[PDB]
Amino acid sequence: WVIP
Amino acid sequence: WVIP
Amino acid sequence: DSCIQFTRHASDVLLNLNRLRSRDILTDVVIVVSREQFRAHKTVLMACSGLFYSIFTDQLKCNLSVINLDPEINPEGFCILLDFMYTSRLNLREGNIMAVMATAMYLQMEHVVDTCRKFIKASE
Amino acid sequence: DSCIQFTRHASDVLLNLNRLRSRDILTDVVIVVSREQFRAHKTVLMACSGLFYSIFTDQLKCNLSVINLDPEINPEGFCILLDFMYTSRLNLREGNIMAVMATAMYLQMEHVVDTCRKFIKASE
Ligand SMILES: O=C1Cc2cc(Nc3nc(Cl)ncc3F)ccc2N1
Ligand SMILES: O=C1Cc2cc(Nc3nc(Cl)ncc3F)ccc2N1
Ligand SMILES: [Cl-]
Ligand SMILES: [Cl-]
């Protein structure tokens, strides 16, 4: 999961 | 396009 | 093999499937979550959820155009997860995390359940 | 928005759609390319090809379960492009590049047409  |  | 691969292809396919959903093109099922209705493509639901994979591989259920979910399922939680299926982006907030995690457990979306558990653990 | 994003989601969705295709699950169209038949999902074809997008948004054609392509289309070229749609990988070879490029032009798959043109230019 990432900060888009 | 890339070499997978 | 000796194939070449287009890096952005999968993301571009998903973006187009979300555009078809927006425009109600070739949607073939309605998911009912109490008083709310959500239109979607059976194939996208099956590709994202262990529950929908089991439903639409069943010889009788594969033919239904309407699926009613358990009354305990929160429509907002379902809406957030449906948006995730079509976009890869999860609108996870302090006010919805419990409903989202409960819905992801029911739909059998292991990666979502995993991130919800981690965000809850960090708050404790 | 304040969303989080799962990097591998789009690739995982496409992998599952290819698994449904392999197992002939919820395929809803047959594409005929002379003596050969190819089963696929209308939504995946529309998400990848400008030609299929135009066909399945047409009020009469959206209901057909069989689509016959132009007799000049090479079945091997079509097979390579269908595999690309479901996997992001293009099996481009000296012996098939002309048929693949001609098929991609017909199907309106601009990124494939672009790589074929570049590989042909490098050989000249
Ligand atoms: O957490 C999850 C997400 C998920 C999706 C699927 N989907 C499919 N699985 C296979 Cl093997 N082939 C085709 C499919 F559409 C099954 C189980 C699970 N569990
Ligand atoms: O080279 C290409 C690939 C391609 C795909 C599509 N697909 C769709 N386009 C839109 Cl805007 N919404 C939904 C779709 F399924 C249209 C044109 C083109 N041209
Ligand atoms: Cl997931
Ligand atoms: Cl393309």
List of chain C residues whose C-beta atoms are within 8 Å of the C-beta of residue A3: none
Q: Give the residue ranges of DSSP H helices in C35-123.
A: 42-48, 50-56, 75-87, 97-107, 110-123
- DSSP reduced 3-state for D31: strand
Q: What distance in Å separates the CA atoms of residue C89 and residue C100, rounded to the nearest whole number?
A: 13
- Method by which the coordinates were obtained: X-ray
H or E element in which residue C66 lies: strand C66-68
Per-residue tokens: C78? 């379902």
Radius of gyration of chain C (CA): 16
How far is ligand 4, taken at its centre, from the CA of residue C86, in Å?
20
The boundaries of the domain holding residue D10 are 1-124
Interface of D with A in 6-45 (CB under 8 A): 6-7
Nearest in space to C86 (alpha carbons), one of C38, C37, C32, C51: C38
Q: Please work out whether the CB of residue D114 comes within 6 Å of at least one atom of ligand 2.
A: no
User: C71 CA distance to ligand 2 centroid (A)?
Assistant: 37
CA distance D33 to C113: 44
The DSSP call for residue D41 is -
Question: Judged by CB atoms within 8 Å, which residues 1-4 of A form the interface with C?
Answer: 1, 4
For chain C, the domain total comes to 1
DSSP single-letter state for residue C65: S
Decide if D51 contacts D107 (C-beta within 8 A): yes
Give the SS3 label for residue D121: helix
Q: What is the CATH number of the domain that holds C45?
A: 3.30.710.10
* Torsion sign (Cα): B1, B2, C2, C3: negative
Say if CB C28 and CB D26 are below 8 A apart: no
HSE of D4 in the Cβ direction (CA atoms, 13 Å)?
Answer: 13
Å from CA of D108 to ligand 2 middle = 9
Contact yes or no for C89 and A4 at CB 8 A: yes
Chain C residues with at least one Cβ partner in D under 8 Å: 1-7, 9-14, 16-17, 20, 25-26, 41-44, 46-48, 56-57, 62, 84-85, 88-93, 111-112, 115
CB D41 within 8 A of CB C43: yes
Give the span between the Cα atoms of D3 and D103, in whole angstroms: 39
To 5 degrees, how large is the angle CA D58–CA D18–CA D78? Answer: 60
Ligand 1 atom with minimal separation from the C110 CA: 1
Distance of CA C55 to the CA centre of its chain: 14
Query: Which ligand approaches the C-alpha of residue D52 most closely?
Result: 2
**8 A C-beta contact, residue D75 and residue D34:** yes
Q: Which chain C residues are closer than 8 Å to B3 by Cβ?
A: 4-5
